[PDB]
Design a protein around this ligand. Structure first.
Ligand SMILES: [Zn+2]
Length: 252
DNA sequence: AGGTAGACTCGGAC
DNA sequence: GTCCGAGCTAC
């Protein structure tokens, strides 16, 4: 799920679990559990707690319980569902939170790639994986000035900068390529080479790109196809270790 | 110093 | 057998 999808998950899941009390936690793939390191401690501590809220930070879900917060990252294919304990589990179900009402919050992930961390609520923000997370891209805390400051200080490409979770929260590969296209900026450009004008324009398109989604791609995955603005074939290379898509005419 | 790159996690699709 | 996407170790 992308940031906008996580926000949608956050919004839709909350009513389905709020006020429910955990009676058991069943773990079928312990490696998903990152903190406490022992999956048996993770399960034990959550038993008896009631779900009070669900927040989002970047692509992280933060389940707020009585004492603890469960911080959950789904990566690409992780999915939550609420369903009856009487019915068979779906394939690739790795963790199940059983509620006293006979319902379950189930975490599936064919890729077994997601993570869960549990800490006392008051500690979650200063521990992994939330520690160091940059500002929400739709927040005033993410400004052209902030972006400019990170850009000047680094030798990395502008794409590498935008992919940095400490720079801005949860801006994935797709939105990075799309935003840079809309801003007219090549992804391989050194971040420090961007003019003030370019920094402003980039900030503006990041917000619009991700803002529009929280309510049709120009370049991502469209390599070999015509640019939608100028008809030039979209190209794909590797930048910052990622598949990178761009129009060599629109972007400079 | 810490910025930065690399290792590492996984399995569906070539 | 090799790729790839997000987010602790060691130069
Ligand atoms: Zn173009």
């Amino acid at each position: 799920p992308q940031l906008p999808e996580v926000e949608t998950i956050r919004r839709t899941l909350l009513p389905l679990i709020v006020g429910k009390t955990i009676e058991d936690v069943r773990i079928f793939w312990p490696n998903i559990i990152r903190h406490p390191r022992d999956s048996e401690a993770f399960a034990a501590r959550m038993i008896g707690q009631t779900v009070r809220g669900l927040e989002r930070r970047g692509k992280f879900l933060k389940f707020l319980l009585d004492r603890d917060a469960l911080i959950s990252h789904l990566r690409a294919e992780g999915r939550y569902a609420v369903a009856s304990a009487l019915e068979p589990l779906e394939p690739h179900t790795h963790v199940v939170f059983c509620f006293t009402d006979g319902s379950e919050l189930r975490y599936r992930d064919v890729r077994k790639f997601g993570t869960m961390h549990v800490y006392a609520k008051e500690e979650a923000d200063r521990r992994p994986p939330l520690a160091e997370l940059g500002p929400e891209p739709l927040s005033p805390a993410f400004s052209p000035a902030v972006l400019a400051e990170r850009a000047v200080k680094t030798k990395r490409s502008v794409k590498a900068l935008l992919l940095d979770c400490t720079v801005v929260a949860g801006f994935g590969n797709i939105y990075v390529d799309e935003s840079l296209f809309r801003a007219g900026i090549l992804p391989g450009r050194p971040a420090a080479s961007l003019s003030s004008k370019e920094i402003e324009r980039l900030h503006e398109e990041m917000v619009a790109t991700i803002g529009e989604a929280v309510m049709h791609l120009y370049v991502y995955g469209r390599q070999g196809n015509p640019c939608k603005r100028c008809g030039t074939p979209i190209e794909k290379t590797v930048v910052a270790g990622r598949g990178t898509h761009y129009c060599p005419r629109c972007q400079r």
